[PDB]
Symmetry: C3
Subunit: 279 residues, 3 copies
């Protein structure tokens, strides 16, 4: 009677990939097919899950959830799409998304494959809230203020300068989309530096997001919208990618961002009862 599980492979067991594993197991319409790592990591000590070096080893795989680093992700995805497998990623470079969508689109439409890209937290569901604020109040300004919380790239940036080993760099929101940078031990915003004993003692993967728009609806001024969340960032991103995996099965070949897909397509459940429950 009921439907067969969606078979998911996770590509790149890193910070996002561990959380993705939890979200796959918990998805009641999804089963883990296996984890794909570089060959160098297969040699490492293992943390019952088929951990292999290529999707071919994992049997049937409808969707591969890409948890690899940004730079390598487009190339990886184009390869997996060319094999008929759908791909999900949370590609987080805003300005290259338009180009990557087109690049992923071409491969997917040929191999009857769906690719959903930039399906994470701010490249992701924050984009969906932004887009909805946009059409409810077309005149005005939106500010996305990332509450105190790490900036992976920024600390990884500072990790590449000569000095006392290890560093933590943070973007701190100072309002109206502007941020201050605080580094614990790249020049156009105010920076503060502190030396610490153990940078590892300061690390926490939660983050705050405050997004606001003040705008006019139709012709009426002073429409106020505020969206706020305090969350574990990698858990939310992996969960958003797993919901996108469900949605990728319900699309036509091609490549989509999350504002190009019906919100109901991300939800597990019977359409009518989702409507009855949510709308």
């Amino acid at each position: 009677r009921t439907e067969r599980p969606i078979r998911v492979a996770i590509i790149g067991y890193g910070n996002i990939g561990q959380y993705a594993l939890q979200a796959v197991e918990e998805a009641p319409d999804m089963e883990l097919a296996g984890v794909v790592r570089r060959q160098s990591s297969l040699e490492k000590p293992l943390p019952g899950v088929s951990v292999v070096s290529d999707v071919s080893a994992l049997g049937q795989v409808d969707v591969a959830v890409l948890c690899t680093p940004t730079r390598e992700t487009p190339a990886i995805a184009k390869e997996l799409l060319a094999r008929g497998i759908h791909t999900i990623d949370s590609f987080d470079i805003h300005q290259e998304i338009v180009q990557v969508r087109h690049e992923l689109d071409e491969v997917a439409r040929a191999h009857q494959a769906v690719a959903i890209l930039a399906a994470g937290t701010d490249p992701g569901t924050c984009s969906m809230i932004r887009s909805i604020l946009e059409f409810m109040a077309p005149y005005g300004i939106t500010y996305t203020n990332v509450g105190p919380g790490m900036s992976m790239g920024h600390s990884v940036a500072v990790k590449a300068i000569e000095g006392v080993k290890d560093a933590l760099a943070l973007t701190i929101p100072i309002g109206t989309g502007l941020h201050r940078r605080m580094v614990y031990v790249f020049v156009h915003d105010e920076t503060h530096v502190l030396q610490v004993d153990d940078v590892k003692q300061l690390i926490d993967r939660g983050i705050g997001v405050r997004m606001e728009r003040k705008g006019v609806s139709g012709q009426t001024q002073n429409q106020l919208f505020t969206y706020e969340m305090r969350i574990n960032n990698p858990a939310l991103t992996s969960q958003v990618m797993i919901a996108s995996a469900r949605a990728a099965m319900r699309q036509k070949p091609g490549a989509y961002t999350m504002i190009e897909i019906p919100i109901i397509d991300f939800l597990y459940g019977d359409r009518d009862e989702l409507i009855r429950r949510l709308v």
Copy 2:
């Protein structure tokens, strides 16, 4: 109300369009007409003004109790003087704080001389914010008040940017950054530019090129006013006042309420802290004490 107050709107800009709605809604007043520069009369007639006397001098309106000046700050004290000199009361929302005392003296002479009332600086931040700020002072005489105007366009500063060279269109916002201090956000439609600091220099400033600054405009604004001080000798008295409002809707509504008050004062010039609050309200005295006190 028997013989309503005949109100003329002077200058049909942002504030004049909102002031027309305030006049309409007010039960004790009726619109006498709108006064515009001859240049604007030659432009086509807006739809909301169909059936409205729209003229270049207030004489053509005939019998005007109060003139609600919705004119640019610089031009308004001189416009107020002329109307006062005809025995016509004037409301304005003149917004240069540092010139209010002097402007008040200048309007006071003319108005007393001609049996007219002027109420000046009667908008939002000069205006009702003044009244609030002043009640806080006598409630807690020792301490400090901060007025933080929430993200929203200052037009005096936005038009400043439109004036500089290499500037097709610009939008410049004042943004509170606490303690009465403010940052400035400039959106320009065109290092890069000769942005430098034609003034602005004594303000932290951020510039940004956008496609269509018209797409960014909303006339709402936030105001957060805070005071910590001493009542008598007790410390740590805490006061907070906040509004999220349509700025021109408020300013013009305050001006129309001030028009009501003008009809009640002896001749002279007044700021809003020089009039009993009850003068601004429509209704019987005892009924308003009973509703409000």
Copy 3:
């Protein structure tokens, strides 16, 4: 019933005036007197001190179990050691953070010689904010804590600017701007400002700006075990000397339950600061 704890107030200034009210209200404590510089005894008696033994030396107050020091920071360690040396316990809210470990060792040596307790640094930020900071740290060992000391008069900065040039009078404020950082607001009765983000304004009367209340915002996001994104906020909006003198009076109560030595506030069972029977405090509070 026990006899009341006899408390003496050392130094009758700002903190000293509030301490008097705290001692009076404290049901288990009794005012032995106030101790001032002899130069201050020649001045006229404050009305609140009518009927109070005001004196130049604690030896004239009879039995004195605890002395609450409301003396300026730099003078307070030497005054403490003198009183501990007689076997009287001492409370201070000494507030030079970088110096507490050192003062504590010094105060500890004398305390143990004369069967006396010193509780030092027992105020609001040196003091109960320290206790709160410390509970957060063990509750979530990985992460960062920001103490944001809301608008509120400084003391060292105020007196810093109060000197320098044509400063007839001045008031210096610390303002929080987030994540532990602060801006300085200077009201004065020229460009010189050197000695952080600072603003300077001239005013006719600096005394008209004075209010002795303060806000404090403590926030922490960190990890419990391996679980991320645990959120903690602590806030107070208070009369600073009223709270500081109350905390010292509470420490006077805790000092009577310690063994000899010097203690900061994160070194004393919270229950020792509270009036009442042990078991009853537990069932009502734990």
